[PDB]
Symmetry: D2
Subunit: 259 residues, 4 copies
Amino acid sequence: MKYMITSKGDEKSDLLRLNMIAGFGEYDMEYDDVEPEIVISIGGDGTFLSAFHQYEERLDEIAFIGIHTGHLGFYADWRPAEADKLVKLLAKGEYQKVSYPLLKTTVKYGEATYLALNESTVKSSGGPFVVDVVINDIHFERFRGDGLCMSTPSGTTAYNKSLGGALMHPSIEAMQLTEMASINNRVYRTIGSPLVFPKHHVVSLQPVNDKDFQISVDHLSILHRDVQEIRYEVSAKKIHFARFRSFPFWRRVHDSFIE
Amino acid sequence: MKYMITSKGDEKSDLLRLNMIAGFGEYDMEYDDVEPEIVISIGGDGTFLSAFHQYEERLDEIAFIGIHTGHLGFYADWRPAEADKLVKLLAKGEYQKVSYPLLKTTVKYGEATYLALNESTVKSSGGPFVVDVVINDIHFERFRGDGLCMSTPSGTTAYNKSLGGALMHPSIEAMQLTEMASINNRVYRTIGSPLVFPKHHVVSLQPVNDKDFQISVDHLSILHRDVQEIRYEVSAKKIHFARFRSFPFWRRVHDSFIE
Amino acid sequence: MKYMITSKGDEKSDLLRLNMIAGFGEYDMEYDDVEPEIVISIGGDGTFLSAFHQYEERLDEIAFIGIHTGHLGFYADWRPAEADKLVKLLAKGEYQKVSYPLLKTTVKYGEATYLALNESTVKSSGGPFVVDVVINDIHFERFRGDGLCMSTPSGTTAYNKSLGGALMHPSIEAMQLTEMASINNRVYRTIGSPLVFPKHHVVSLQPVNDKDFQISVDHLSILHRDVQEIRYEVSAKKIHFARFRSFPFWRRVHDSFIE
Amino acid sequence: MKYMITSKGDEKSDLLRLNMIAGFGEYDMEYDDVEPEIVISIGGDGTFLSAFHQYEERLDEIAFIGIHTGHLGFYADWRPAEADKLVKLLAKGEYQKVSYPLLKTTVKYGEATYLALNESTVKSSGGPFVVDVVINDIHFERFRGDGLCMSTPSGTTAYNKSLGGALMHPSIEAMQLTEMASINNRVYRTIGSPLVFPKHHVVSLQPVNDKDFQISVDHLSILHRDVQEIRYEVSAKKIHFARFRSFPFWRRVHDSFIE
Ligand SMILES: CCn1c(C)nc2c(N)ncnc21
Ligand SMILES: CCn1c(C)nc2c(N)ncnc21
Ligand SMILES: CCn1c(C)nc2c(N)ncnc21
Ligand SMILES: CCn1c(C)nc2c(N)ncnc21
């Protein structure tokens, strides 16, 4: 089975990577980083994030796995001491696949599409940030503040959580919008609460004055110029995970934030 | 078609009720408050809440409608001037049915089940409130504060919203838990963020010291004694609405909070 | 020097109390719980709270001290192993006095005054809670929600903190009001932010419909009937602490919440 | 009396400015923008902000006034129709002076000091933002998030309010720190609550990895490189306002946010 392994780059991860390659070397397991079926990431959730974007083109052909050499990550939920258990279980299968929803981000000018595993945010380049929020072609509010954040279900535990958003189970195919330091007075008015949109709901951001935005998708962030509208909706593509055990989402939330 | 009409009790509502009964009196429309198929509520969302609980037994046999004689309610979303339009459209049908999820609340002692349209809350009778939160038979946290609130999707715009929870579209079959003034220090630790649970997820509250709780379901609130566990999960029953127009949920959110 | 010692009542505290009485028995130290000059509390901050209210009449004649037999309290900031150090330093003095502001609460009917070290809260007895907030005889807002909380500076780390309020240094003679789950829509409007009032500013709560309120002062909470107005203002009396060391307020905040 | 008038630059403001200059032209009132005693700003609070920074050198020699040609500002609290009332009352005096606290910001490298009327914020240039927060030379926390904000009392109604901070009366000589989207998990830990520091308390921010920060003071924001520490403390200088009427701070808060 075609596979590849990305590493965080430090001593702990590169050496654990060479051990698994030697472990797979005892099986009928071909290494390939062009068209792999199993993508293993070793490091942290940030390392897993780059592994997902490296192969965002053939998501349906890949099952992702993550080893955390630091603390317990949400996508990297395998201890290094369990790596040899992993190599043996990958050899044939009998494992199952688990799929999480994704977020499609479309940006039109005078058109680029992105796929986000965690979240996508919008901020203003330099000056004030004012956008008209449009939900299913109906004007909902005029936002003035620092920015907005649209999050995937599994991405709610990251930036979405720091902004007051709700943590939602990844079996729910939905997206969640949150606000950043919005102004609310007798002039400007925002909803304030986080909003959870289902499949087939389109959230569109339209500029009011300035047309340049600092848009981010996960940990890649590039300034866009002459933006006409930013379009958010739950993607039709899903990321596929290889499951060998029973690690519930709420147990991962408990271990990361409670204890 | 069997129907009944509840009124808020004031001058504006009782007179609008007698007009619709006379309007239905010109059609093949039988009045019945024992086994109606169409339940019309005139007043506010609180009046709609009592209309739902009056007939929570045969929810699948009923389609609810609401007229707001005050401000725009979320369940009562028909202007009084549109009442004659309503009477004519009820006469034959051609309308469609729209269903929202509900919340089942089970209370065991040393067992009562409830159905909630908005939310169900738990508080302590007098003294401190300490409960162990159990998600799918796994201990998640020990809550110490004022109380907890489990909300339906359509109920997120009410008490759930005042507690910082997210507003989620009612097409999502889910429930949302929020916290009330929880203590978080170097001793006690709660998640803080709101939690959104899908279907078939069971949230269970277990007492630590005191066993008496002030439990509420919508606007009915009764003290319970010798409680063993409180069990929350998305109900299998759904409330059915009669739709004649296109009033999206986000448009109702906009009119109630933005403008 | 006249002194008395209250204990939490458990094994750890009563035995530490008898040791200090024997320690003071070797000095010119008279025990008196009628008119003491040094009030020592052994247990937790709740034990200190009762010690303060036991002698709220002669606050200016007393210097309070607190030993924490559990975790680090904010008022009980002496380890039990440092009790013998305490007994020796109390013997003559050379210690200094540190004063914190207090909160006066006046309740008028058709008049009772209270002194609060932590906070004073207002809630509704059973039904909805609606009060008109009046600041310096000027109407500021109409609050509809669960309740309000007026906190002392040193009391900001308690209930005030759980409600989102700011932690303010106790050298600032001020009070802080916070809200509990307020309703904000296109009908009702509250400020939302916590408010910090200086000396000589009077905050007055006036009923709108119901006239019965569940009013609390620290950990004593009694239902009041036929209430005309609740009046909050920074008290002119101050609680006096005996200081022997340098334990800054921000260091106490750090040890309790950070580590 | 030496005076000058800045204008927002639009039609409404420049024409109201020329009327007041002609109004002062009938009195013994000399126009001077080098060393004025009365600085009049016409426009919004942002126009007042630039008027303050234009003359931040001789604050003790100046009394500021503000006319709002748009909506009710907090510093610009005079209606344009009351401009002729203003010109007459400035002619001799009989008015009184009202002083507000300020925020001193010191930035050391391998030293620049600033004066802020609203707030001063810190953010990271590009990458993650990690700073060690030091209060009175004692380490308090390690902050990881989007940034921090230190606000003046009168500046609490601006950016400080959007971040959840408390609105505090400007008669209190203090500063308030608030957090922006901080990460809190089983690894990183921040206090979360806003902190209110009195006079003579020094808050110091120290870098952990990156040493470049985007620092702002009111509406001027410049990237700093090779930063050793950022030092916040309540300034010894105060801004002086000319008062002719009784417009309480809480009445200004009410008119801006409630109604
Ligand atoms: C900042 C580290 N991190 C990343 C890269 N993804 C996540 C995530 N889903 N939840 C929590 N923390 C996360
Ligand atoms: C307090 C009035 N009210 C009721 C009874 N239900 C709701 C609701 N779903 N959303 C908003 N307000 C509501
Ligand atoms: C609930 C325990 N507790 C009491 C009784 N006072 C306090 C206080 N000022 N800060 C924190 N916790 C406190
Ligand atoms: C953004 C407009 N604005 C300025 C420039 N100062 C303030 C202030 N103190 N309170 C509210 N709004 C403000």
